[PDB]
Amino acid sequence: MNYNNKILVSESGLSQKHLIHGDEELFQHELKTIFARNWLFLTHDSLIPAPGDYVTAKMGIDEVIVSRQNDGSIRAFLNVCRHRGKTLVSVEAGNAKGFVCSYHGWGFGSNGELQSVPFEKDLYGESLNKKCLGLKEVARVESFHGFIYGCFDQEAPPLMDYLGDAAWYLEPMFKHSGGLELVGPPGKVVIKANWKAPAENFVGDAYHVGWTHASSLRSGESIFSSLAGNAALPPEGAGLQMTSKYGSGMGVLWDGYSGVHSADLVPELMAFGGAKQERLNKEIGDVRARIYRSHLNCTVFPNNSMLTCSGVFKVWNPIDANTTEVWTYAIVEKDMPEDLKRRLADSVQRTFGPAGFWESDDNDNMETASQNGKKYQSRDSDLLSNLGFGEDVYGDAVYPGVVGKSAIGETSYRGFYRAYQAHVSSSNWAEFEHASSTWHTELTKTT
Amino acid sequence: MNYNNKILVSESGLSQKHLIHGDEELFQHELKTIFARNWLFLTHDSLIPAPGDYVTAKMGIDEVIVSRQNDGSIRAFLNVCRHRGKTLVSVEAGNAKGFVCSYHGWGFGSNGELQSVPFEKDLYGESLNKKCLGLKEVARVESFHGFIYGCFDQEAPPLMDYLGDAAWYLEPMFKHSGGLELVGPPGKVVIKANWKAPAENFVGDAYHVGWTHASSLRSGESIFSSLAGNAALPPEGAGLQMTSKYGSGMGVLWDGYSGVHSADLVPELMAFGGAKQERLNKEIGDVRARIYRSHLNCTVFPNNSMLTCSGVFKVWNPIDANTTEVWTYAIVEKDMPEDLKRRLADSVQRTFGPAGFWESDDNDNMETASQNGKKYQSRDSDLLSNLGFGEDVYGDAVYPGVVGKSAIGETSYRGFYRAYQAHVSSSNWAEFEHASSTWHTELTKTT
Amino acid sequence: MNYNNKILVSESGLSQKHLIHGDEELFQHELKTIFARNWLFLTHDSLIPAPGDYVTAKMGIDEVIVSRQNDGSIRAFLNVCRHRGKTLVSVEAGNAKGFVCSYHGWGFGSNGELQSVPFEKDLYGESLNKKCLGLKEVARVESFHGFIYGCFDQEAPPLMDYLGDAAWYLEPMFKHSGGLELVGPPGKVVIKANWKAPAENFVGDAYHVGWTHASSLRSGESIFSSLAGNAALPPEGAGLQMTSKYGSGMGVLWDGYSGVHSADLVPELMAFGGAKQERLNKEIGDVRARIYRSHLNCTVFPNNSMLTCSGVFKVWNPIDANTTEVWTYAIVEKDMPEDLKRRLADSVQRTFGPAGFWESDDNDNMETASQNGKKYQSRDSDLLSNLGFGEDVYGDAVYPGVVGKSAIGETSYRGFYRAYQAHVSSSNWAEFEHASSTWHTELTKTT
Amino acid sequence: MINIQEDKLVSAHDAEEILRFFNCHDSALQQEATTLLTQEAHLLDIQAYRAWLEHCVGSEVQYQVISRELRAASERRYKLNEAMNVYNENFQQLKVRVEHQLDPQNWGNSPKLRFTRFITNVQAAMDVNDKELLHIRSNVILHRARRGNQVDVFYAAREDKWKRGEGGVRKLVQRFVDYPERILQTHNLMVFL
Amino acid sequence: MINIQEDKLVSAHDAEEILRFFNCHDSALQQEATTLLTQEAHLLDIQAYRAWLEHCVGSEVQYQVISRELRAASERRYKLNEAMNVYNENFQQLKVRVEHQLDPQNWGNSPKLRFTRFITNVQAAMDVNDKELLHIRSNVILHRARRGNQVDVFYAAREDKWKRGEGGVRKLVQRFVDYPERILQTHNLMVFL
Amino acid sequence: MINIQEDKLVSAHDAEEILRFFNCHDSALQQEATTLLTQEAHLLDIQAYRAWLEHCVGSEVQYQVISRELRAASERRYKLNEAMNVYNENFQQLKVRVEHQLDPQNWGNSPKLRFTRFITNVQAAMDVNDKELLHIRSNVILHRARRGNQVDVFYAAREDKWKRGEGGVRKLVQRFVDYPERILQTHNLMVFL
Numbered sequence A, B, C: 001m002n003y004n005n006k007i008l009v010s011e012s013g014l015s016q017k018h019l020i021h022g023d024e025e026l027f028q029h030e031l032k033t034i035f036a037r038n039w040l041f042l043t044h045d046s047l048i049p050a051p052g053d054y055v056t057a058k059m060g061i062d063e064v065i066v067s068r069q070n071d072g073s074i075r076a077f078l079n080v081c082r083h084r085g086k087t088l089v090s091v092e093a094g095n096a097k098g099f100v101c102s103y104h105g106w107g108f109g110s111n112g113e114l115q116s117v118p119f120e121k122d123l124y125g126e127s128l129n130k131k132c133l134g135l136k137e138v139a140r141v142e143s144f145h146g147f148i149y150g151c152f153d154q155e156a157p158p159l160m161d162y163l164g165d166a167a168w169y170l171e172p173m174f175k176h177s178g179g180l181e182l183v184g185p186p187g188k189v190v191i192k193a194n195w196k197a198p199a200e201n202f203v204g205d206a207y208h209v210g211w212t213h214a215s216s217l218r219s220g221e222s223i224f225s226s227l228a229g230n231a232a233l234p235p236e237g238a239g240l241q242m243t244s245k246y247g248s249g250m251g252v253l254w255d256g257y258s259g260v261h262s263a264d265l266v267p268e269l270m271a272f273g274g275a276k277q278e279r280l281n282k283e284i285g286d287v288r289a290r291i292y293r294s295h296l297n298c299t300v301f302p303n304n305s306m307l308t309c310s311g312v313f314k315v316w317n318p319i320d321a322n323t324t325e326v327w328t329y330a331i332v333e334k335d336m337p338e339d340l341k342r343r344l345a346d347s348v349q350r351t352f353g354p355a356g357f358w359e360s361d362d363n364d365n366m367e368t369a370s371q372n373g374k375k376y377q378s379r380d381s382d383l384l385s386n387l388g389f390g391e392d393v394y395g396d397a398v399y400p401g402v403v404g405k406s407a408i409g410e411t412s413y414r415g416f417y418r419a420y421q422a423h424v425s426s427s428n429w430a431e432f433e434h435a436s437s438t439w440h441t442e443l444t445k446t447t
Numbered sequence D, E, F: 001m002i003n004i005q006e007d008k009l010v011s012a013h014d015a016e017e018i019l020r021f022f023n024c025h026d027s028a029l030q031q032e033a034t035t036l037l038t039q040e041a042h043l044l045d046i047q048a049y050r051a052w053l054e055h056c057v058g059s060e061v062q063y064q065v066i067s068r069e070l071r072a073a074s075e076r077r078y079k080l081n082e083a084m085n086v087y088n089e090n091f092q093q094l095k096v097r098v099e100h101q102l103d104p105q106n107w108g109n110s111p112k113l114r115f116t117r118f119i120t121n122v123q124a125a126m127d128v129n130d131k132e133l134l135h136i137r138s139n140v141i142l143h144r145a146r147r148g149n150q151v152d153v154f155y156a157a158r159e160d161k162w163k164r165g166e167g168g169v170r171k172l173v174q175r176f177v178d179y180p181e182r183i184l185q186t187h188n189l190m191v192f193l
């Protein structure tokens, strides 16, 4: 397949070839054009707060060690020994000033430097140039209010510019709330789906909630219970959708601060969010303060997703075209009482973790949609994402980005797949930028 | 591999490259040139007799929904939603006027039409063209006396012409007996063999019966018990082999109406068949009436096989080059007493079902022969199918087709692989027909 | 990938691309350029000592039958029937004058001839040319003091020339000790590693012993216990490394006759070896007699490895790029007392068999190093094998081959990968020889 | 215990079977049952199929394993055959299968297979109406290994009826298994569950 | 029995639990425990989730399954949350999950799932301080099959506390499972272990 | 019971072992055996290997697991070593392996492994000639999980001899396992079956 010419995503992101969820050659291509090029979620300050603290993380199919440096910075390195290529670290988290390889005993510092070699003087003499033998380092490591992302490509935009218009929507919760922390360790589960299926589901799919989750809504009696069995459309004006230049996007559902959580947490959450919102009115304005306590279903391109207020935080780690390793953390506001934080963390896993009763509703959706992309008569078929097209705006006076002013639609899919197509047919960031010069014009075309 | 030029099957079908049982690229090619082009077995009238009745079935690696329409016709559709591509139906059989997708709730009718979309007026307005969004329909669906076949290729010959000379042999049992019914549900088992191994085994392999099944013959004391351990050649004149233009073929073993069934069913079967045969003499002639109560081991090209009289009915569903999903039904004559039908059904599964003691004899034959096709030193080796070559006739006054007038031989292999090679090197039906203009001349060359 | 041009191993064998442990295309290429071209271990005289005795063995991914002929010679044949390609022999060892195929009953002799065909006269008449239908025979089968190797390539050098300079080191134990026998049956275990990882580990890795096996050394208190936890470098002069033209190589550790065996066998072994060594002084000289009772860690290119004195004998059978089937035998000296032989055999399996506590230390080393070769950011990385480079000699007056006169180093890696690169970029033995005309000069370049 | 209008996922058949073991517990009958099944599993594991027939299987036996077609939980119209019989054997039919196993020309049995059975969750209760009929329920994991790298593992619940026959030995007169996997991934089901 | 300074791989928690079953053996309590767990497994296997709640689960229950982060055996500084809760349910939360299973719009349950549980290694001992609290340890293999070719098998050790409640029926008041696989390869853990 | 000329697939060894448990049933010996094996499995599962040695393993122990070469069912000439020893350990050798497990530089044990054992099909009988020797047969499923996504499951039948030793504690004096899979697909067999 010629990725320069082949149309995998049609103009305006209106449709995608079903094969993108199943093609192994395209998966391999994605390793280069998607995962080696873009910003990928690693960890949070709260998980490595002290010098020497480290965690392992995936970046695409690669594994990295992410380490808090003595100077307070964070550096990340391929989890691979420079000698004969054994995996260096076999645990998920810890604290250490260095990492020793268990094969021949080479010792690397937390800063990735080759620091000791067993019997170096006797064996290597002086001919081993250790300064050239440091662990292969992740080029770029940046933070968005405590959330740490990495990028193998030195030429990438800074993380803030990369979040583009999505940053405006995230800031009330990520910044003005006083800050979030990530509660680990994450749940970890392999699903037989392409990483793009849950990515697209979280970036813009409010449509499925009432139907896919009819039973969970009815059973848990969450604030969204109204939508169950498709019993109710949320009022015209119940929210909006947005998307951005570099692919990130989200749905907004007004005032849904208790989110997916079952009735046992609803009064406390609604009281707590409303209280902070009243304080925030004076600091950031009524619109943004409301955004803070509104439910955002977001994907940070390409494979990091989240539900603010619900507190769900996801990493869709790619394994092959029909295999994904799902990591699930909880996000909580730092100034929440500790007991509330703990119950919120548990509830995030209860609904969306390895035994999450909502996450289970989605399973067959993600798996079969992905697996059908391998079936012969479906490969060249078109997945449709035209809902709301011709009504999207750009440059609105109140809400930034390409915006659909309705709670349910496919605006964010179109934005996600536009960026995806732009990367797949590009050899570097310069070419992506060239292919993205009229991005919002393309997304708003019939409007 | 260049499939236009590469000789996978030698002239007259005398030999095949062993790699055809193991090569994954060729498997993918087969999805296009074999399974997307030819007639594939779906179901029987007896399994979907009422309006709204449906079953799922495989066509190649694709899954389809096969539905009885209100007007009495049958239509078949890809089991894939037109929205985001989720599998529509997750059951194997049922009755319904439509199928609702559990992802976003799109409702399709039994006729494949997109009939409802949740909150269509609020969300899509009038801009959703539902008449363009019906399920992807199987182009061709035809019946051979109640047995329903499908074909994705609109250009295929009608099913009757496609059965060619084989139809003449099937008709006494399928048509003149008063009709057959298929007894479901089928047994379903994955074997580690190429779909072609049991296809070729059923199309023309009487040779292996005495040896492969020595133990089952001796244990069950079936009417074929004579052949056990190679203790006996069946008399010169015990049967014949035939093959046809489009690949279908069968062996005929004279008078073996009780077939593979163990001694507990032999007297009843032989009495019942002989009785109908006497009535049939007057209607269709002595030769054909005898054919009715003679054991036919047949493959309907490419992957549907059967043993008449025994009542074994097989679908070799392809998964990859060394994986096949075997479906096993029983066929019974409609005018058999119900108690006999039930015992025949059980006996079909006892011998050839998931715990079939005959089917188990064959397992290692099919699996290892298929797996050896991946081994480096065997890929370019030649599988031999020359038995009986130079003695086949065409246009005989009594028995139609290319015919070997001996019970044991490889006439049907040659016919099967001639058609297989013709398709693999062709881009469409016109090219197959061009490559098949001297088909019987090629099969009878040394005669 | 263009294997003629692509540099997978840099000049002098100093480094290798990590992808060689993970690339499936290269694995397939290796089947042709490594395993179909070189000498592969089959069995030992002691395992098939009588006419009619046979064993099955792998050669690459192919399976062969290896049979003692009536005339005392050994012939080997593909374990595949000439008719429809079923696996002929399903056992691992036995005695027989022939092999009958269980599919259609074709009978082949121990000499591979097609000897009987069921009902040949009735069915085939005289038209079956049986002399053309013998089992596909392994071109070359040669012995090195009872150890039998096979080669599919008629153009290969004789086994002795192929062992090159390594033969000199093996002979004191293999020949002058009075001969070895192989104790079967072998243990058999699948590991998730490339065949090259344990190949390289056995050919030249004394470096890892003290660190990888710190716990086994400390626990078993073997003669190498000194090295545990990297507590000790063996004295300057404790041994050497060698390598050769066709890739075979080994490490020598002076006087370590009891080898990996735990303290319960140490006194007996050291007494027995020292005793034979004193007799050997007069026959083969002091240097070679000492070599006899010195621990050799050797790989016979490409995938046969061994530890003399320890008595460990390994076959790394390739399955795919990250899968290897490990066969483990014991080697013992024929003139050892029977009770000592039995305890040595048990101890070989105790340390290096399926539950070998040493072999388990190595597992994660071999598996992760191999699996990292598939990871995107590591494929184009360089595995380093430069230890000891610039100090290797050739043509020394006492020790033949390219020799590193130090116990720990990577001389043998360089020799192993030089030969490996030479084959991978060559189409035949003539081209390998052309690419190997300055082999020792290339290996000794900075010296 | 169970009301299947409230417990909406429970079948009438399953609810009936549970009532059988709940009402009366007799841990001595439970011990006879455990021994009976352990010895049966032992005989089958060593492939003493003749001994199994002679010692464990009653002349009136029905030995049945079904595979049930996947239908919609809400289905209520489609009324064609719900299941097929993987096994549905009388004693004579079991005998044929045993002969097939022991035949020296059963090529599939060379080299010799290896079976290991794990029997758990044994429950036992006497039938209320026939005081000589013992109901025994048990679950089996059956591990079959052959030819180097073939490994197949079966999982099932067994509904048995056992009755004293020749010489007062309790023998199997009915076994019913509804096999839990619709598509077998074990090459075949040619094992006595 | 155990000294965890010598038995260096044993956790304090694990050593405490073993001391509980070693000191006193009462094979009658062991039999009550076997019956209790066999009947619970039977109810769960037939998907009588309401019956399970009513008959097996106490109003004060904590039903907990954790997944523990992989840390270095020698780790001793890093002190952040060691585990997350796959389950950590009170009775009301179990009830929500049971309602979710029984809802006719739970699409994932059509066609009907098939469960088979294997309970082994049962041990039972009364708490020393509360003479009405029964400690039961048991191991489970849980086989779940659905939709033709999906097969998931779970393996776990269960630390239970059971106590007489309504009508003198012993019910589960605590279950603790530390799930042994860090990354699940079973699509999810949506099964009652 | 068994005649191996009629039951053609049964080995002389297997037929001998079955005769041992058939003649006399003593369900109290069966209960001692169940407790013995459950406690042994518990200790091994929590990796209390020192405790296992001290409490479960006799000084005269032979701990043996073999892998038998695949030979033709009709074979009768070829007479070379039929099997190799995956294990064939005396107490001292077991001790070496236990030391290896506990060593802080056993890198393979970081992060800590997770073991879960399932013991079933327990049978027990006293030797006829030595009245202090207990024969116990049992089957094990052993689940080992490590490093996130490595999962290995072992299946075996165990032929044990247990004898009262120090302080009257019954300890293992012989274990024999003929491992049913010829080619291991579990990375290694480095587990105590």
Ligand SMILES: O=C(O)Cc1c[nH]c2ccccc12
Residues within 6 Å of the ligand: A201, A202, A203, A204, A205, A206, A209, A251, A253, A295, A297, A307, A358, A362
């Ligand atoms: O249920 C999900 O898949 C997560 C999700 C995506 N869009 C949503 C809108 C509202 C609530 C949850 C979601």
Ligand SMILES: O=C(O)Cc1c[nH]c2ccccc12
Residues within 6 Å of the ligand: B201, B202, B203, B204, B205, B206, B209, B251, B253, B295, B297, B307, B358, B362
């Ligand atoms: O046993 C089989 O594989 C089916 C089959 C193929 N040809 C046959 C001839 C007679 C009876 C059965 C068969």
Ligand SMILES: O=C(O)Cc1c[nH]c2ccccc12
Residues within 6 Å of the ligand: C201, C202, C203, C204, C205, C206, C209, C251, C253, C295, C297, C307, C358, C362
């Ligand atoms: O431990 C091994 O991997 C085998 C091996 C390779 N080189 C060695 C040197 C000394 C002892 C053992 C080995």
Ligand code: FES
Residues within 6 Å of the ligand: A081, A082, A083, A084, A085, A086, A101, A102, A103, A104, A105, A106
């Ligand atoms: S591979 Fe890491 S020190 Fe050698």
Ligand code: FES
Residues within 6 Å of the ligand: B081, B082, B083, B084, B085, B086, B101, B102, B103, B104, B105, B106
């Ligand atoms: S995928 Fe079917 S309705 Fe959306």
Ligand code: FES
Residues within 6 Å of the ligand: C081, C082, C083, C084, C085, C086, C101, C102, C103, C104, C105, C106
């Ligand atoms: S395949 Fe061997 S005789 Fe036919």
Ligand SMILES: [Fe+3]
Residues within 6 Å of the ligand: A208, A209, A212, A213, A358, A361, A362
């Ligand atoms: Fe969802």
Ligand SMILES: [Fe+3]
Residues within 6 Å of the ligand: B208, B209, B212, B213, B358, B361, B362
């Ligand atoms: Fe057959």
Ligand SMILES: [Fe+3]
Residues within 6 Å of the ligand: C208, C209, C212, C213, C358, C361, C362
């Ligand atoms: Fe090693």
